[PDB]
Scaffold this active site. Structure first.
Site, PDB file in Angstrom:
ATOM      1  CG  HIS A  80      54.524  24.660  -4.317  1.00  0.00           C
ATOM      2  ND1 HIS A  80      55.608  24.875  -3.490  1.00  0.00           N
ATOM      3  CD2 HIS A  80      53.926  23.525  -3.866  1.00  0.00           C
ATOM      4  CE1 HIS A  80      55.647  23.926  -2.564  1.00  0.00           C
ATOM      5  NE2 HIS A  80      54.652  23.089  -2.780  1.00  0.00           N
ATOM      6  CG  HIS A  84      53.374  20.645  -8.037  1.00  0.00           C
ATOM      7  ND1 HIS A  84      53.774  19.411  -7.559  1.00  0.00           N
ATOM      8  CD2 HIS A  84      52.447  21.104  -7.166  1.00  0.00           C
ATOM      9  CE1 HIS A  84      53.116  19.156  -6.441  1.00  0.00           C
ATOM     10  NE2 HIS A  84      52.314  20.164  -6.175  1.00  0.00           N
ATOM     11  CG  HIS A 118      47.084  20.569  -5.616  1.00  0.00           C
ATOM     12  ND1 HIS A 118      47.646  20.217  -6.828  1.00  0.00           N
ATOM     13  CD2 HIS A 118      48.098  20.601  -4.717  1.00  0.00           C
ATOM     14  CE1 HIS A 118      48.948  20.036  -6.654  1.00  0.00           C
ATOM     15  NE2 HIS A 118      49.242  20.275  -5.388  1.00  0.00           N
ATOM     16  CG  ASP A 119      50.286  23.419  -4.613  1.00  0.00           C
ATOM     17  OD1 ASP A 119      49.916  23.758  -3.447  1.00  0.00           O
ATOM     18  OD2 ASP A 119      51.072  22.393  -4.857  1.00  0.00           O
ATOM     19  CG  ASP A 229      50.803  17.737  -3.042  1.00  0.00           C
ATOM     20  OD1 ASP A 229      50.699  18.186  -1.882  1.00  0.00           O
ATOM     21  OD2 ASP A 229      51.168  18.528  -4.016  1.00  0.00           O
ATOM     22  CD  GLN A 281      64.276  14.914   0.071  1.00  0.00           C
ATOM     23  OE1 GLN A 281      63.676  14.205  -0.728  1.00  0.00           O
ATOM     24  NE2 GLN A 281      63.693  15.947   0.696  1.00  0.00           N
TER      25      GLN A 281
HETATM   26  C1  LIG Z   1      60.777  16.755  -3.850  1.00  0.00           C
HETATM   27  C2  LIG Z   1      59.395  16.535  -3.279  1.00  0.00           C
HETATM   28  O1  LIG Z   1      58.463  16.193  -4.004  1.00  0.00           O
HETATM   29  C3  LIG Z   1      59.170  16.750  -1.824  1.00  0.00           C
HETATM   30  C4  LIG Z   1      57.971  17.188  -1.458  1.00  0.00           C
HETATM   31  C5  LIG Z   1      57.774  17.819  -0.121  1.00  0.00           C
HETATM   32  C6  LIG Z   1      58.810  17.938   0.699  1.00  0.00           C
HETATM   33  C7  LIG Z   1      60.164  17.444   0.289  1.00  0.00           C
HETATM   34  C8  LIG Z   1      60.337  16.884  -0.896  1.00  0.00           C
HETATM   35  O2  LIG Z   1      61.183  17.534   1.151  1.00  0.00           O
HETATM   36  C9  LIG Z   1      60.916  17.595   2.581  1.00  0.00           C
HETATM   37  C10 LIG Z   1      59.724  18.518   2.869  1.00  0.00           C
HETATM   38  O3  LIG Z   1      58.612  18.237   1.981  1.00  0.00           O
HETATM   39 NI    NI Z   2      51.170  20.482  -4.378  1.00  0.00          NI
HETATM   40 NI    NI Z   3      50.112  22.679  -1.545  1.00  0.00          NI
END
Ligand SMILES: CC(=O)c1ccc2c(c1)OCCO2
Ligand code: NI
Ligand code: NI
EC number: 3.1.4.17
Length: 331
Positions: A80, A84, A118-119, A229, A281
């Protein structure tokens, strides 16, 4: 403590920066990866603001101060971070270019800035953590805790001497743009994504979606924010995989802190449970990413490449699960 401010050398450097001509063409594409061009990141943002909003949308001096101070108020966390921010801003640029006249001048400048900010001041800890351990921020912001903080940080930067890029707006347009930015940043709270996407899918499938209706506009903009995002899942596989390594570094560090406080973390945040990552994932793509880009493509047809790329990456995670992965390199 306090808001960080860029140096004169930093913003004057950005003012004089010129983008390599070869990148102009590349920057228009959804799949563009800013990764190999770190020294150019602030310049890429200037270029994008200029192409979308015009070279006279903002006073250049104030714009360069703002950008370099924004960079200084991102922390050196694994995911973050400043990289990003610029990646999310680039996705928004590509969405706006492909859908330019659906959005007002005010919305385009508001949204590019919202994405860059935003972060802001993210610490590498989730809303879940902050609320569990009663961080002062969770007291101040009962829901969407970090996102309300990121908006607050945005306003603090605008308030620095010579940083208010929005001052030249009429009092009414000024209020409107801060509201565009606030709603856009709050929308990046994934907790709000699930209801937003469900609502939008319904409005689309029934044919009641109307971009002349402000609440509808706000929701579409919200989903655009989610899409930008999460856009690391829309890059080429090797880029997506390298980025996943970075976000899990944050997750595992948070889980480590939970263990110190007597609580076992969720498996996603447990560095002793890395075998569960590929299925995790798959869950994330099926529950969040794929539905997001599916609905966004329905509403904004030119965003289809994001969905196609997301689908390709879901296939790659499935390959991993089946044990079909080939050689991978890590930083
Ligand atoms: C890598 C990525 O952009 C991404 C973003 C958010 C996440 C994530 C992967 O894994 C599960 C929880 O939330
Ligand atoms: Ni973000
Ligand atoms: Ni955020």
């Amino acid at each position: 403590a306090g808001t960080s401010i860029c140096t004169s050398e930093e913003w004057q450097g950005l003012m004089q920066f010129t983008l390599p001509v070869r990148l102009c063409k590349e920057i228009e594409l959804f799949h563009f990866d800013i990764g190999p061009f770190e020294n150019m990141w602030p310049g890429i943002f200037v270029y994008m603001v200029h192409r979308s909003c015009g070279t006279s949308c903002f006073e250049l001096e104030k714009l360069c101060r703002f950008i370099m101070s924004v960079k200084k108020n991102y922390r050196r966390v694994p995911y973050h971070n400043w990289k990003h921010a610029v990646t999310v801003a680039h996705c928004m640029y590509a969405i706006l270019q492909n859908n330019h006249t659906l959005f007002t001048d005010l919305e385009r400048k508001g949204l590019l800035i919202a994405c860059l900010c935003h972060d802001l001041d993210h610490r590498g800890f989730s809303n879940s953590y902050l609320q569990k351990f009663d961080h002062p921020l969770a007291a101040l912001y009962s829901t969407s805790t970090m996102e309300q903080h990121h908006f607050s940080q945005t306003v603090s930067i605008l308030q620095l001497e010579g940083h208010n890029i929005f001052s030249t707006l009429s009092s009414s347009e000024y209020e409107q743009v801060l509201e565009i930015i606030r709603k856009a940043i709050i929308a990046t709270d994934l907790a709000l994504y699930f209801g937003n996407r469900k609502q939008l899918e319904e409005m689309y499938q029934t044919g009641s979606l109307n971009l002349n209706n402000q609440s509808h506009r706000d929701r579409v903009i919200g989903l655009m924010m989610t899409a930008c995002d999460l856009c690391s899942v829309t890059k080429l596989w090797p880029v997506t995989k390298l980025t996943a390594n970075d976000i899990y570094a944050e997750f595992w560090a948070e889980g480590d802190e939970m263990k110190k406080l007597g609580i076992q973390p969720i498996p996603m945040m447990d560095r002793d449970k890395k075998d569960e990552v590929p299925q995790g994932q798959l869950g994330f793509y099926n529950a969040v990413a794929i539905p997001c880009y599916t609905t966004l493509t329905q509403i904004l047809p030119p965003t289809e490449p994001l969905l196609k790329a997301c689908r390709d990456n879901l296939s790659q995670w499935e390959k991993v699960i089946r044990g079909e992965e080939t050689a991978t390199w890590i930083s």
